[model samples]
Target: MFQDVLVITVAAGRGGDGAVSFRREKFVPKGGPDGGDGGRGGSVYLRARGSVDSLSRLSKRTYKAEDGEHGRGSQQHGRGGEDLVIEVPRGTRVFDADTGELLADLTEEGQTVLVARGGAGGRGNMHFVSPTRQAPRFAEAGEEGEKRRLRLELMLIADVGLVGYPNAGKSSLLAAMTRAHPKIAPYPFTTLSPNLGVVEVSEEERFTLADIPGIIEGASEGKGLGLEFLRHIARTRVLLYVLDAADEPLKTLETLRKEVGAYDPALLRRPSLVALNKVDLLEEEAVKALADALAREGLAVLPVSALTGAGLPALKEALHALVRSTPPPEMPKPVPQAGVEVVPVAEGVYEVRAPEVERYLARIKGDLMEAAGYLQEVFRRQGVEAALRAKGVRAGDLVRIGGLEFEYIPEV
Candidate 1:
């Protein structure tokens, strides 16, 4: 079964808790604190692979990374958690399930994106030791990991897209042109999903082709299976309309155009060609008349028989020529950034916001006095104190940093 669309929940690992233990040796009488910091949690990553063709292999709805090991006594630091890597098909698009916002588009092989970030480890009780308080007992708690519900949509990357109604010989044409073996039958909706094949025009020249399911008259209105498979061809460079010559070729072509236009008007403007399939079953004069009629409608049409292998080479060469002539699409650019800013919450309270600053603060640990001194120095260097003072802070007022609170004092 070829599964493309899926909804799953992914979570990063939680950080380990810091240990709070005092040194109690046989010879040493007064040993201060000797606790160690906790290790960082594991992160969740999504990697693209060319070998992976379907999302059906991922049956589980939820995926989580490993949690960090807890800190030990005797100054032994905890072990960091192992990162979780999930492999997905290339051309997969990750989106936020709740907001429907695009998070990452995995188009290239071996491409990776971090979906969820791990939490930071906590500090040990030894980090709380100050000049006034010799033996501190409090230890910082580990932070929680990031969690989110994600929607995974897989879009097949192909050079040519086969568009036609169900049982219109599109699948038959694909099987004849490439080695791809799609299930063919006389009934409608035979292909439930898209089928990809590598069509070799020459020894050195080859391109990928996608045979999507049939599209009905109201396919764009979600009437048939065509709407679900339309997006798979959004990245294709050329559109190949395969019509059954025995059927109403002109009517089929017109319906196909209307459906494609309704789904995405831009797709109708792309380089496109028409194949009047099953020409062996039609009279030579009839085939010529149908081809001439379709040609007058601004479509390059060719009469071919997918079952008898007639005019297959000509169709392949025409498609190859069109593909070679089309230019590659433009790439998306990145956005710029300024810097972090410090915001004043209240008279004596302030909140520091910045990715780099928050990451640094999350990893800080050691003696309380040292930690306090280090924090003061950081605030001073970053002009955080100046910002707070400018916001009407008194000398003997209260201050807050991250999760810690303290009483403010003048330097002089």
Candidate 2:
């Protein structure tokens, strides 16, 4: 069974706690503080491996990465947490479950991407000892690692997409040319979903193909899994229309073309070659007339019997020639960096519209006095007084940080 969607939770390892200890050597008269700093936590990554085909392996449980090792005695620093690299199939899109924000899209082999970053280590007590305070009792706690629940969706990317009505011999053609083994029955809707296959033209010349489920009338309007199957054709550079040459040949052909044109006008622009499949049931003169009729409609139609393997070699050669001649479609330009809107709820009350700052707020703890002091020094260095003056801020204007408000007294 092929799985298309998966949900998993991952967490980067937390930093080890800083060691607090005093050296007690036999030869030394007075032992001094010799605590060591903690080690950093491990990170979580999403690596693309060719071995993985789907997210079925990840369906067992909630996935979690390794955690950091704790600090040790004798001034020994804690060991760093091991980084966990989770391999996934290509074309997997990762999104944050809580925010529904896209995180990463892995589409290439051996591509490594960081899903969660590890936490930094804390300073030991040895760094805090001073002349005024000779012995520091407490050490800084380790920073907590980043954790998130992510949703993964797989969008199959293929080179050629086979689309047509039910019993159009799509699965038959797939089994004839490729390694894919799609169930072949004498019935319509044999394929319930999309199936992928790789065709080899020599050792190096190869292309991926997708056999989508059958399309009925009103497929473009979400009728009979039409919208679901339409997505499979989006990534393909070529589209092959497989028609049931033996069953209602003329009307079936016109309806198939209209459905594709309506489903996506872009599909009409793509290079489409008609495969008059099941031609073994038709006579030699009938095949010629069918081919000529399709040609009159400006379509390059090739008659082939998947069971007898007739005209398949010519079709494959045509596909190869088309694939070689067509240049890849250009991608859209990336979004440029721009300023974000910051809404001020009231006078002297401004909100930051920065996403990074919002994420920083989520990571901060109540015992962040040192971090607050650092922010104050940073504000002073950034010429906050000059900015406030430009904003008509007075000496008694109120400023807030982490819910604590204070009167602003500018230093002259």
Q: Judged by TM-score, which candidate is best?
A: 1
TM-score of 1: 0.53
lDDT of all predictions, in order shown?
0.73, 0.65
| Candidate 2 TM-score over all chains jointly | 0.48
Error of 2 at 38 (Å): 1.6
Report each candidate's C-alpha RMSD, comma-separated, in the order given.
12.6, 14.4
Report the lDDT tens digits of candidate 1 across residue range 341-404: 5466876565655454455565554445545665676667776666656656667777655556
Q: At residue 400, what lDDT does model 2 achieve?
A: 48
Q: What is the lDDT of candidate 2?
A: 0.65
Q: List TM-score per model, in order.
A: 0.53, 0.48
Candidate 1 lDDT trough over 10 residues, lowest sum? 183-192
